[PDB]
Design a protein around this ligand. Structure first.
Ligand code: ADP
Ligand code: XB2
Ligand code: MG
Lengths: 900, 34
């Protein structure tokens, strides 16, 4: 149409044309004959029925195959009007393939976005499509979901509208497999709010750049994606009462610290490493005094280090610019690159065993003094601390000699813990900017907390990342199917609860519970005598045959040294248990970190200042905070779908996408959006809002009950009486009635308020153009006085005029009166405003401080109970390991005595 | 809730572990008698 031109050149990638709709109507089609049939290489395919054979069907396919099909495996083609629809809820015949071919015909035309009722499903284009042009964002401004073509920008507008209407916090929950676009879609949602506030900036830019700067440290090319991030992130975007952008808050859950020193074949270390090595800037290369060739540094160099798709010279330029805009000082940016460099050098330190003491001494002293020079330690006390760490025994410290293998492992642990703390500090500095100190009333939380991933080799953070997403999809299950459906029964609607069966809470409890995998790894890593093999024994014993998601591995590809596999929501992920306990505890040589605390490098001290609380437990508590923070928000979900393994753009593999829609439970979200009631409004808020539909049903001044008035008004609309229901405090609408009431409200308002707006445009234009007339008048007296000014200074008499009048009485008295009135007016206003503010604000402050101390006492009660539980568990687990050893020897002794 | 369930499962496991050592030390004494 004429209006779609606002979408510009992106329009062919957003909406099937009207000429295509008429063309579709020209298509030979028959509701009685056009059906889908299932197949191997394509999950579903278009076909035409040729015969009906009782409880059997035969049909022939678009690509010429013929197959016998059963009724439950055959399902209607929707008529050409409905094919490729914008919103899958509007489908006439609802089934999995109509979802697939709505996707495949849209994505076949590079229309990537579709809704599945209330929310969006996105199938990934590896091509950079124009659907994200910043002038396409403006086309979503206020364009409600029933009018707009599907896009992520529609969800962002919907969240901003529900924010302003319900006066409640919102959220946008971007989800999917790895490589689907969660990081880019997050960057687009943030771009949405940034450019929306940009037409109506420091925070606006900072929220966008807060992604790539954290990416370059956070992210590494993996086998599954060239730009897969390795840390969970939760953002809150805070808006003021006037709806403008106010603040933002970046919370990050766990960096994949293990990657810093170890990469499998075909995967990189974190991008910051190679982009500093592969460098356009020699100064970065020599200030680290690192070699330009990546290969000689053992820890980063293993795996694969050059990639088909990344201009690391520019990705370094990009990370540099991201810290420039985020306002990290040059000394901070350089120090964190120095720390990355030192973690590179730290693997190059060579240690040799003494001929008789089995103690590590450095032969490769050049690498150790290079490292110490960067971290601001000394070569000798660094080497002495590493080889001879100090441990406390009573009040005095004792010195222990380290093995060459265990000093290598300790240097790895120092590299990891310096990297991970440097990342969390960088986040804390981002959260220390990103604050324009403006008063806050609403926030919209955008989440990208992991891609699901399978590599051939998965480790501690591949458990963390897959689990952390797992919880976000179970949050989808709970919000759409539990929280939404319970509300209907609570309101007393004649509604029957339907079980969608989509539940995975057993597998989150499998990880999260005090008997889960992460609970085991935290209870085990306290014992200094624990080892990965017994961790494997206890881990298998606690879950095998006790969890539906825990199963023994097959190890068909060999490698059965120590494996387990966990069926996270989107499929298999196999895990390698090797090294996990050291990774969970992350024990640092206390002399070496005490020397770090003592460093000349202000960052390294700040990182280590103020060095039971394992990495598992800290991550866990952050993610539990996440869900508690998120339940106080109104969520919209975004399902990002990967189309194909091989990065082939525009190609769309049906088995991978359909399996993703299966694991994301999107078809159920269609069912519940069509069958259920997508929108409810409080009786007071709606009666007042849309009474405009029939003011004779709700006269002003006269007493009206909101429930009884709502009953009369809706009976007066003459709409199908089955499309609404009455609750105790909320009105209930179907999606057909909601949309019809929404549009009738918009039109009734349009007829009244456009007249009112015409008057408002009248006053706005009149008053502003009057101001332009006043500023014209001031311009006129300016140019007149400038003409007077030239006329005066070229006039020879000016010598009297200029000098005498400052001396004369007018400058003595008129200026005095001007200052007197200025001071008295400012006196009056400043006095009243400051007294008002203080009197109100002191009583508010004391009320909040009292509530702060009450909750503080609550925290004190918590810390008391947790300390009791800690001492109880510590004594129970220490006595278990002692007695368990005693029973092992008792049994072996009795076996010996029976053998006698 | 985490700390209480942790203590509760440690006590239950200790109960079963006590039953284990009860049977073991009994059988060791029986072997010493025989
Ligand atoms: N809608 C899209 N448009 C353009 N490129 C995309 C889109 N979705 C994914 N990609 C590409 O796929 C890769 C992964 O995107 P990303 O947002 O990082 O997802 P993930 O974080 O799951 O890897 C990137 O190279 C990105 O450019
Ligand atoms: C309970 C929940 C699903 N819900 C609703 O059911 C309706 C909401 N808002 C109504 C008031 C609205 C309609 C149209 C534009 C803005 C707001 N919000 C909501 O959050
Ligand atoms: Mg990502």
């Amino acid at each position: 149409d004429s209006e779609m031109a606002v979408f510009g050149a992106a329009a062919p990638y957003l909406r099937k044309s009207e000429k295509e709709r008429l063309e579709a109507q020209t298509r030979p089609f028959d509701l009685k004959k056009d059906v889908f049939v299932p197949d191997d290489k394509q999950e579903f395919v278009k076909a035409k029925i040729v015969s009906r054979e009782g409880g059997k069907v035969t049909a022939e396919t678009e690509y010429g195959k013929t197959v016998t099909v059963k009724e439950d495996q055959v399902m209607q083609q929707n008529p050409p009007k409905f094919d490729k629809i914008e919103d899958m809820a509007m489908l006439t015949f609802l089934h999995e393939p109509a979802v697939l071919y709505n996707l495949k015909d849209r994505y076949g035309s590079w229309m990537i976005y579709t809704y599945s009722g209330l929310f969006c499903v996105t199938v990934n284009p590896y091509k950079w499509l124009p659907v994200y042009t910043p002038e396409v964002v403006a086309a979503y401004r206020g364009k409600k979901r029933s009018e707009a073509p599907p896009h992520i920008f529609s969800i962002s507008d919907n969240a901003y509208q529900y924010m302003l209407t319900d006066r409640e916090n919102q959220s946008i929950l971007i989800t999917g497999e790895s490589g689907a676009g969660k990081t880019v879609n997050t960057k687009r949602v943030i771009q949405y709010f940034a450019v929306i506030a940009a037409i109506g900036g420091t925070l606006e830019d900072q929220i966008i750049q807060a992604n790539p700067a954290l990416e370059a440290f956070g992210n590494a090319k993996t086998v599954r994606n060239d730009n897969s991030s390795r840390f969970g992130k939760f953002i809150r975007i805070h808006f003021g009462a006037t709806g403008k952008l106010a603040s933002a808050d970046i919370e990050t859950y766990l960096l994949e610290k293990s990657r810093v020193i170890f990469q499998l074949k075909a995967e990189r270390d974190y991008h910051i490493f190679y982009q500093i090595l592969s460098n356009k800037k020699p100064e970065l290369l020599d200030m680290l005094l690192i070699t330009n060739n990546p290969y000689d540094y053992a820890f980063i160099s293993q795996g694969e280090t050059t990639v088909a798709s990344i201009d690391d010279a520019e990705e370094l330029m990009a990370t540099d610019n991201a810290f420039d805009v985020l306002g990290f000082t040059s000394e901070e940016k350089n120090s964190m690159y120095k720390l990355t460099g030192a973690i590179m050098h730290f693997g190059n330190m060579k240690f040799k065993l003494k001929q008789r003491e089995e103690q590590a001494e450095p032969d490769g002293t050049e690498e150790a003094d290079k490292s110490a020079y960067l971290m601001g330690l000394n070569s000798a006390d660094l080497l002495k601390g590493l080889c001879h760490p100090r441990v406390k025994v009573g009040n005095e410290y004792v010195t222990k000699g380290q093995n060459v293998q265990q000093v290598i492992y300790a240097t790895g642990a120092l590299a990891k813990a310096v990297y991970e703390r440097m990342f969390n500090w960088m986040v804390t500095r981002i959260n220390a900017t990103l604050e324009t100190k403006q008063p806050r009333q609403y926030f919209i939380g955008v989440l990208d907390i992991a891609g699901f991933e399978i590599f051939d080799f998965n480790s501690f953070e591949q458990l963390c990342i897959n689990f952390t997403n797992e919880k976000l999809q179970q949050f989808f299950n709970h919000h759409m199917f539990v929280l939404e459906q319970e509300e209907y029964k609570k309101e007393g609607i004649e509604w029957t609860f339907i079980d969608f069966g989509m539940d995975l809470q057993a597998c989150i409890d499998l990880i999260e519970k005090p008997m889960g995998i992460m609970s085991i790894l935290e209870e085990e890593c306290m014992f200094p005598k624990a080892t990965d093999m017994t961790f494997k024994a206890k881990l298998f014993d606690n879950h095998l045959g006790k969890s539906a998601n825990f199963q023994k591995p097959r190890n068909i590809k060999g490698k059965p040294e120590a494996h387990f596999s966990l069926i996270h929501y989107a499929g298999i992920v196999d895990y390698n248990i090797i090294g996990w306990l050291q990774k969970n505890k992350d024990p640092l040589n206390e002399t070496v970190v005490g020397l770090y605390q003592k460093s000349s490098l202000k960052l390294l001290s700040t990182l280590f200042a103020n060095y039971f609380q394992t990495v598992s437990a800290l991550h866990r508590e952050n993610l539990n905070k996440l869900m508690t923070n998120l339940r106080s928000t109104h969520p919209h979900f975004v399902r990002c779908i990967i189309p194909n393994e091989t990065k082939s753009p525009g190609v769309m593999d049906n088995p991978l996408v359909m399996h993703q829609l299966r694991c994301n439970g999107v078809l159920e979200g269609i069912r519940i959006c069509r069958k259920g009631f997508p929108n409810r409004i409080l009786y007071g808020d709606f009666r007042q809002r849309y009474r405009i539909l029939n003011p004779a049903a709700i006269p002003e001044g006269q007493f009206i009950d909101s429930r009884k008035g709502a009953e009369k008004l809706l009976s007066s609309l003459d709409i199908d009486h089955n499309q609404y229901k009455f609750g105790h405090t909320k009105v209930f609408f179907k999606a057909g009635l909601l949309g019809l009431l929404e549009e009738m409200r918009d039109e009734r308002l349009s007829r009244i308020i456009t007249r009112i707006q015409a008057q408002s445009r009248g006053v706005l234009a009149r008053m502003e153009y009057k101001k332009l007339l006043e500023r014209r008048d001031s311009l006129l007296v300016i140019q007149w006085n400038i003409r007077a000014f030239m006329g005066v200074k070229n006039w020879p008499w000016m010598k009297l005029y200029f000098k005498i009048k400052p001396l004369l009485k007018s400058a003595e008295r008129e200026k005095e009166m001007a200052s007197m009135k200025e001071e008295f007016t400012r006196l009056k206003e400043a006095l009243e405003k400051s007294e008002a503010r203080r009197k109100e604000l002191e009583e508010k402050m004391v009320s909040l401080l009292q509530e702060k101390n009450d909750l503080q006492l609550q925290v004190q009660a918590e810390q008391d109970n947790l300390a009791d539980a800690e001492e109880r568990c510590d004594q129970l687990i220490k006595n278990k390991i002692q007695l368990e050893a005693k029973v092992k020897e008792m049994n072996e002794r009795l076996e010996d005595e029976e053998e006698m």
